[PDB]
Design a protein around this nucleic acid. Structure first.
Ligand SMILES: [Mg+2]
Lengths: 100, 49
RNA sequence: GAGCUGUAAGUAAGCUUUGAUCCAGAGAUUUCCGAAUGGGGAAACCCAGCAUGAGUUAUGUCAUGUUAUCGAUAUGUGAAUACAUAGCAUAUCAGAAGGCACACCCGGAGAACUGAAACAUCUUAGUACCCGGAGGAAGAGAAAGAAAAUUCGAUUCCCUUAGUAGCGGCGAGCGAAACGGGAAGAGCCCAAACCAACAAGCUUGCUUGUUGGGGUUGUAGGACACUCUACGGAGUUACAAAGGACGACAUUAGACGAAUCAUCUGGAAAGAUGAAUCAAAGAAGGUAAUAAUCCUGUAGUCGAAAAUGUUGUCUCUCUUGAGUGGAUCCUGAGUACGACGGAGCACGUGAAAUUCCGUCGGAAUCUGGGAGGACCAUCUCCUAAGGCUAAAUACUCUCUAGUGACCGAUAGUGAACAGUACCGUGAGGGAAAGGUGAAAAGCACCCCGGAAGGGGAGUGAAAUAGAACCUGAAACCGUGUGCU
RNA sequence: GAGGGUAGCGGAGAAAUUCCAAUCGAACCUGGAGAUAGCUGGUUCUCUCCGAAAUAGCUUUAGGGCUAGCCUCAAGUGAUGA
RNA sequence: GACAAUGGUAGGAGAGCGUUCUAAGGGCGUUGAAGCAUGAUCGUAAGGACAUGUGGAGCGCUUAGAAGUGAGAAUGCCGGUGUGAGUAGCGAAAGACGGGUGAGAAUCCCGUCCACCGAUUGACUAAGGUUUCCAGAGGAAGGCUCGUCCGCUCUGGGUUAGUCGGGUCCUAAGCUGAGGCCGACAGGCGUAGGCGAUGGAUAACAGGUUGAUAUUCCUGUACCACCUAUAAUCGUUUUAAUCG
RNA sequence: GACUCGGUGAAAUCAUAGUACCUGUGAAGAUGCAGGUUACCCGCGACAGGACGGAAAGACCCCGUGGAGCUUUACUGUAGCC
């Protein structure tokens, strides 16, 4: 489960192996947007004259994995209660720095 | 006044009623006397005029 | 615990880590109509009285309360009529009224087509329809019973007895019960004799009334007579009733939850090939093809501020129980029965006993009364004419969790997008209509054209996937050709 | 012309079986209801072996039914068949 | 191996083919499943394969089990598409020409001439309908042809009351009806009283003005109810003026 | 109106159709059968002899132990009345 500012890795699709970072979330369809991944080309009409534009489209969230902060490998995520508050762990190391 | 059958000699059947022998007499009802319908059998039995 | 302002896409303007949107519990608000209830009315509107209040020099206007009919409970008053009464008036209460899944249950009333190879007794059938009353069940229920052993011991339901015994234009057809095997199991309260009081007549004797106690039955019990005895039991499901405490479970939101990498083909891998790992988890669904190890989950374990529902332990609240005498007193009356006319019992009035309704008659009192299929005698069993009662049983418009050698868009609900288009004055009848792609990346720009449509270019793995969008059969309509 | 009344086992009729929503020897709608139909129509893949009847008798029977006759399958007995 | 048998309707008997689903086993599939199309293939029949094109994600085989298991006919039910056929019809009637607009004109707009109705094809008010009304834009469908037009599509607008017609007034027929009478239930009737116009009562006219309203808006001049001030007349409130 | 040209454009019906006549034959009145006799391929305007032409599961007739309305000294009942 990934937040808005993390640094992830793509594990499925055309762009498998790229890193990028998250910029949008869309939780109702569970599809994130990652920079430089899944780029599309739109035909926009004049609204100024338009033309072909390139932006990123959303990818399904289960095609993305976080990176172990220490060893820098993909990992799943668990939870832990500290100070009576929930944090994220890397299933291969300790705490996971996710402030922004 | 329940219902029943009238029977012929060939035993054909038709619906029919038995009525009660109601009479209009003046009986003592709470306080003032009133004039109501009462059967003759109930009159012979359990009520005073 | 990071996005959010319905389906629902946009833009705009905003909200949110000082915790939003969202989920559960409890509150607040809740226009008008409708039983509709101040009066009226062609529902969703019109017109008022009374009392407060705002406003106006004052009217007009506005705001908030209250005003149906029956019923209950008080008070006052009182006609034909003297007392009285019927009425009448005032004030408190809020008892009824209407609706439904009204499926199942209990009552009232009750067909015909049909079968009998016609039809009338009979059957369809006490079925359909209509009306009333209710509950989570209802009804029945504690022997005036079943029987014929050496008996049993309230009721209901299941299996058998058995298509037997019986009934029947003895035709068509209708059709039990006891014994036996099981589910469940529970018993109680009155009326009366009598006693103690109170009260009116009365003459203080009696009568009657009111309260309380007592008391409840068959090989007879209880009153009375007498002799032996006391707070442990009982309880809100009948057996009398209220309400407190502290607990324990279960709902109604949730939380944690093990383990995988690489190459090939490809638009994309979960597939193939190779090497690994978890399992109290190899249910299931998603993810760009087919995943135990990617996501949501699963096995397992944890969790409630609040409101409900059960259930314990205390509290609480009630309350003596035996024996002998047995026939002195009490023991359910217009009742039980009978005749006539009907109905229900498997049973068509018959050898009809047994049980109800209408109309007339009309008992007995323990040496009594009823039943054992006309009736009589003897035997055996029981004790009517007052009431209450859980469980085993029936049903599903619903809610929660699941299941299927059930359907897969002419099927399955009439209805996957509707009791809607539409039809009918009305009651009422009643359709057709699912699929782009993995992702909108939904075709910038150029050309012909008023547009619609099209040809290129571009997106995409694919555009003969371009929205009349998966696949795209046949009928049917065309264009070009080899032989004729 | 407007506002009203009479309703199907019924109403209305200067009378014709006439009218009661383009329908009347008994309106329309929903239910009993899949009424009943000894009558007519229909009833869906293949090959192999055998193969009729259109007649007695009774029948509220005569284009229906029942028993017998004639077909088929299986078992049995054994000259009973032509 | 020898011999024999083998037409067939009602109808009896036997052996099989194929369809959907389930169980167990064993397989195939993005290097392309089912379906669809074509072929000169195989089996005694029902039927089974293989190859190629299209298609884009599921499906065979073996043994056994279970059935909504096979269509050419029912004046069958639903959908689609033909034939008749470029055929019948295009719903009473008088139009002609010039100018305009437009991609496009017999059919739209403007003008002149001609024609038809005129106890009416003219002008008012009711029922009934319910936005059809007006302006700007449009031309896919509707319009029995056409269409630049429209009662059609899109966007935005439009109905003004003390006196007009209803209510805050009255009653007819009829309908309801507190108490009441009757009735298996449901309910039927009816007294006082209510409701109910098609009738009775009841105060406003002339002119101006919009694309769309007018006795309603504006100007002028009126009338009818009700309330408060300013007042002559008011004189126990019997009476008196007053009201009743 | 019909007929020719421009616009628009249905219907009943329909087993498939390359659909002649005569004398016969035949379920006894033939475009489809036999023996002959006629006839190059394709339209348009007209006529009504045949296709037992279309339309409506004959209303006449008979049958069904089918319905309904009406009558009476048919059978059995019954509302009422005495
Ligand atoms: Mg063609």
């Amino acid at each position: 489960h990934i937040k808005k500012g993390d640094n992830v890795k793509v594990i499925a699709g055309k762009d498998k192996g790229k890193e990028g970072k998250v910029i949008a979330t869309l939780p109702k369809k569970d599809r994130v947007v990652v920079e430089g991944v899944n780029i599309m080309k739109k035909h926009q009409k004049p609204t100024p004259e338009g033309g072909i534009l390139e932006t990123e489209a959303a990818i399904h969230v289960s095609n993305v994995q976080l990176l172990d902060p220490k060893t820098n490998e993909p990992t799943r995520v668990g939870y832990k209660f500290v100070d009576g508050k929930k944090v994220r762990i890397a299933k291969k190391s300790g705490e996971e720095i996710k402030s922004n | 006044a329940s219902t029943g059958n009238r029977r012929s000699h060939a035993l054909n059947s038709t619906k029919r009623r038995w009525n009660a022998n109601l009479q209009k007499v003046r009986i003592l009802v709470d306080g003032k006397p009133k004039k109501v319908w009462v059967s003759a059998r109930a009159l012979k039995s359990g009520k005073v005029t």
